[model samples]
Target: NDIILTDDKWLLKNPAWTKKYNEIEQSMPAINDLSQFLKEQNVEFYFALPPSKTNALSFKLPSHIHTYAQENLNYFLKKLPADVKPIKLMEHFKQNYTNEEIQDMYFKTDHHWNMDGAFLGYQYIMNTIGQQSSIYKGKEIAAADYTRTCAQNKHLVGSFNNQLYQLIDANGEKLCYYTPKDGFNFTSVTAKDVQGTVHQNLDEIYGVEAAADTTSYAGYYTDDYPEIVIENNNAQNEVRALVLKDSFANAIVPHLAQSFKHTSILDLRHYHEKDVYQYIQDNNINMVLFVYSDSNLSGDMFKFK
Candidate 1:
């Protein structure tokens, strides 16, 4: 029952994440300057510090794995420029959540949070956006219309597949529907290479990715970019929030779209920094959310350089 506790299943032989941290510290200056520039631009920005699994679920982990996640997170916070505000979900969760809540917070087979956990993160984002921006107007929002699926079953064999990317388990969210179906519909018009001239097709818009099953998940996108615009609402001056992110933001974006007039996702992994900045400016973005898993923070610090 405890294959992970038994220790024969681990593919890694050492503390891999630490070696990466050393490489990232070398690139901190440029990252710091960029955070400062975003603050200077008058847009309210937030760093969604989604804690790494190794830290959040360490109590369930092997002793050899330890909890260096907080150590690295501390380093990032201490070194991070004052301009960026950290939406401290990890700390908030620790002070607020129970063990069962924590279980609902993560996918037993994937590295990302489940739909329920994402909704909790959404509450923070909505509160933060409403506090800083004029967008929400203090309306109540609740996640409705739940959907479920399987990602990892017990038979799955890969390690991440077993503990990090399994197929027997999974979860998802659909906007709340009161009736059996209100005929819910949502569409999008998104640009991919905001830095370049790319009007991304849906696949490119959601981003190019391999599912945990190693299937190409990005292939699901059609040309629409899955726009979440207000076709049925009455708010004027469409407020847009651009999320510049890597693969980490996928789970969090759905919740954010519920709060905005429009939500556009731009993956900087494929864009030049100058181009991405230009796109943000051209869009007249109200806010920018940089979603990075804490494990990737230092490495991402260097990526912009």
Candidate 2:
């Protein structure tokens, strides 16, 4: 079977996942050149690869597919230039989570990670960045600083299920979310869309009453925007970051904001501005991260300029 739907799970079968994709291979050279340009700009670059659900549940993958998944990543790392730093959570997820625990990381109805998994991604990215950067080295945000709860009634409309907008494949589930015991260090947050319309704060970004709606993921996290800036007053680090991402970063960027003084998130699909390198220089963003799913092609994301 190339796809499966259990009593509670819906996922691609081994064959679906095993098929080789040329996206990475086709895009690596450009990514290397992009990293070189970022290096020239004196910005630290990290290309962060988030996993597809198929890759995360490695224990369930048929032997050949798992090998392909493993080798594919190794090949990526191998071909990647030394100037570019990488955090492949595809491999990390397999190493870190148990087969049983992995279930909670994603939605049964949707294709994306649940908040719990998203938080882990946030944690991993911060720690990995810390491992290499002097500014973030000793200031890594730890898991102990955050706690999670799953209480609200969730009627999750599946991403994949909604392809037909398919049956609306909606399901009742609890939204399991993590929070900093105190709160995020972000003192101010704002966003600008492709249309150049600015969203003032959490209220404007999520809408006036969005915070009160516990059932919608868009209410808790974000939908999508061309660019966002999160400024924090935390004295632990005096760092500025530029996060270039797709929707995957929506769940993780807010958490990354906790560590830096200024964090900017840009979704290039909507961020039509061509001079991105100049934009970063103008913004004084020194740390640049590319966050996207394994299915993504760098060429697609970098197509703006």
Candidate 3:
């Protein structure tokens, strides 16, 4: 009864989730501690608030539920320390993109956004990092450059959207891919543990065979593992970056790989290693991004080990 089937074929989470969201508050000390630690290490740290499907497609939802997600985002941002610089993606989507544009950016049957939504976040990151005009050179690519693959939810206990689709006999959205052209081949390596267990190539990263039951968005990196490394063979710059992220980052990483020579993603939720601070120092990472969607911001997920 909490889930409302919108006329637009999109699923709206019940107000109970929003009620829980409103009552939950973020940890400022944890945020301040993390920021202070990054500052002490002389690393540039940034936080990105990736908009949720609800926030992105609010215009199609009931007026009461429309602003709940965005309000949560604003509340979370307000609780952060003064030193924490955040990319306000929620506001960006609402202000810059039209309702139709926003609708097209997300999957109607899933909670995650399509490649188009991730690309918008990518553009914001590039512009924020001061590499927009130099490396990308004001160039934009079309949707035709990407390929869409339908996922099959191979991993049991699949994405929430997958479960919802199964429950309601609804369709799932296809995963979109925009591979690099012009000799910018990138290699990926993933590991479940910190002891250097490695699985290389897109087959391991995407789990192509298991994708039959996988949520298209999760098919990118599979569920947030301990760590993943991406190496760009022909990157324009030698910048190395580390992303401490959630599932929201799974799709956006491919785009970031085009700009950075080396990229390592760590999901603290699953990554139990206590050497994150040391990793930043040892790797000489030029940038660190704390990326999470508004739906994930109000929990203990942001707390470091």
Candidate 4:
């Protein structure tokens, strides 16, 4: 029962239907070790396991589905080192958001959280980490930085459904995204395509703005790169950050980069050129953040080695 197949809800669910995370449990030590190693280098390390759809939208889901996700969360939370400062986003969302807001944070046909969820997570992260630093404290992204486009004539069937043949959610939903007001003020940003071609231009990463209304969840954000470096020339802090993330960061990393001098996003699955430690040193990064969707807690994103 690891996954709940599509029902009349027209949504697929993974509410910890199975206990198959032995590898993730084993990988906990590597994360702890990475934190200790980074501490020695005088770098601040933080990790956040953002809520999955089943958790974020539990108010609309079966009550039984809620308990399972929490049980799995508690099991994994205990293993992470406290020094790594794992932000409790799951609990935060469960307590803070109104039922309606919670319901709107995710898509009916997709698996990932939308712009609302991403922005809330961004605020909490900056404010929490801000508790320690002078420059970072409370310097989160504001409403003025970007314009929220909710119903920009966008129609989405989402990646999970793979174009759900069934009509009604009815067979479509609207996915929202935010574009920066002044545009991204980055000194540099770089990534590569599947063909290994390097890309440095903003239009190349985000692609040209399209007028079409039909889109998928992946269409809302940039692709997942093995590595992405954002040097924000107009950032507010001197902190250099490295975010060890999975595809979940695609919606939120750009905002996080706004507060730091340079923010590097790394996905370990395809990053084989250099290890994290070496990359951090080479980039002069002093703050490290680990971000992943809870669905990927068992995936290879935690391979800090």
Candidate 5:
């Protein structure tokens, strides 16, 4: 069920994953319960679950596979507790764009979304947070500083594209990426090791060099860390946000970093047991956002400690 169907694609997950899916489904209510807990603390929390590549590109899958994946996605969404406000990115893509159009939003060989889809997610997140202006806010920032260049990246090969290169003897594909043209003043970004020592201006936040590697996506905070704090001294806005997320949040952070005065990206997969409430109070966090892909929504890792 997980075999490669062709040189261009392969089954992303085994159809037998349903059993595992059931376990994840059982934990859904607990996850939503956590959301309500956050709200009670007055933390303006938002949830974002980006669609999986297979779900968004169902047209590329065989009939049975497509239907199987779609059903699972629908089941998961329907199970969310009423108060958990998910962005419903999959529904948005399906309704607003055609299968062919959506296909272009992600890499044909990779499981991650192309820059097009990532930006679409970015716009949706900002809009949901009532800060839609942040999507294009960089333009104005750049205009004010003529000496600074606007954000742009040369198309490069992606992780999936890189894998396809050797397996099928294929040519690498390009994915577009951009950053704010003007520079951001993140006064300091620090990551700490288990020993509690601080590492400053670490490449841990955003590995700029990863952009040239086989997997450019890793450039955004390669892998996960216990805690990463970003302080934007020159922020145009005052909202301080804490992003609790999975890998999907990595790509979304660059855009978000510019939108708030301070942003703390915490990936519980790597973060140890800590008081989330105290962290919010100590850091003065006013907004909290949860970001995950459909694939991780039901995983045990999705829950708050």
Candidate 6:
């Protein structure tokens, strides 16, 4: 009952801020190794690094405190084994946009980027991958009347689970906005394998419960897969992207639908098959992208199991 601002608890003793990154740095080999392996197999592997709330705003913290999640990701890039191609999004955006512009790129209550942020990242991806062919086109769409909420309370938790209460003043605020096409012609499916195999229907895609989160701040993108067919049609060489992503992908994928004839999204979290390499071979996949958020990077890469 006597708790006050004077008595706050740090999530871990000393935070080991840099050491935590050391652990993440050590894990880069798995991603690098996997990328190289996939490359040798004739598939290209790319990475999309999402920003961490803790790291993005850690500077707001006092000198005595720091975020391991951010420092580690910075160091992790240096350790990559050289064959992998990282999208370098954080650096790219920082160079082109002001901090205010970049700040508008992320969601206040969620770990993923806001619609503006997602659109920026998409442009980066299109620029890089689009260069590979003449048919690669970058089209823009407007996300009208997207809402941004400024609530900062217990029910609204971000990546840290409100670990650093200090940010609550700056972060508890929320933003909610979606395109006019939020529900347009979209179908959801739960993906099952690496070869892009998914359940047959949208009914059980994310189950009935996913609808609840969509109404709340947690509902940025549909949890269900919108489409199933992974197309290899030769629009201009049959290029298709195999997105290996975490939850951040939900908002990003909708923007990608118009770009590719067919897109296959795989969430390695619930993926069961241990022999996905064989499936990749069978699908004739064109490119492999691991779209991961920094906060959950280590867990996201554990699909090796």
Largest lDDT belongs to which candidate?
Answer: 4
Model 5, span 1-305: residue lDDT tens: 14333324532432323434576677776667676776676667677878877567656655653245556666766777665666778878888989889877765544567666877887777666664323223323222322322123333333432253222324545445545555445788887645666677745556555455344555533445677788887776677888887777665566677667788988776777575666777787777777787656566566555
Q: Ten-residue segment with the worst summed lDDT in candidate 2? A: 159-168
| lDDT values for all models | 0.52, 0.68, 0.64, 0.70, 0.63, 0.52
Question: What lDDT does candidate 2 reach at residue 115?
Answer: 82
Lowest lDDT block of 10, candidate 3: 131-140
Please give the distance, in angstroms, between residue 164's alpha carbon in candidate 1 and its true position after superposition.
11
| TM-score (all chains, Cα) for each model | 0.68, 0.82, 0.78, 0.87, 0.77, 0.67
Tens-digit lDDT track of model 3 for 236-278: 6666788888787877666666667788888886776655777
Comparison by lDDT, 1 against 5, better one: 5
**Native-vs-model 3 lDDT?**
0.64
Looking at model 4, how many pairs of residues clash? 1
Worst 10 residues of 1 by lDDT: 172-181
User: Which segments of model 4 are wrong by more than 4 Å?
Assistant: 1-4, 8-10, 19-23, 59-67, 134-138, 160-171, 207-210
Considering lDDT, which of the candidate structures 1 and 4 is the better prediction for this target? 4
Q: Which candidate leads the pack in TM-score? A: 4
Candidate 4's error at 74, in angstroms?
Answer: 1.8
Error of 4 at 67 (Å): 4.9
6 Cα displacement, candidate 6 (Å) = 15
Candidate 6 structure quality by residue, lDDT tens digits, 1-305:
11111122211112225545546655666676677778787776667776544444444446776557556666767776566667767677767877666766665444456656766676677667666434345443333423323322322233333342233342233333343343423343334533565564333332223223223223334452323343424223445566777766666664554456556776665554443465466676666766776555564454453
Please give the range of 10 consecutive residues that has the lowest summed lDDT in model 6: 1-10
Give the Å shift of residue 44 in candidate 3.
Answer: 0.5
Q: Which stretches of candidate 6 lie over 4 Å from their true place?
A: 1-16, 68-70, 132-214, 224-237
Clash count for each candidate, listed in order shown? 22, 1, 7, 1, 5, 10
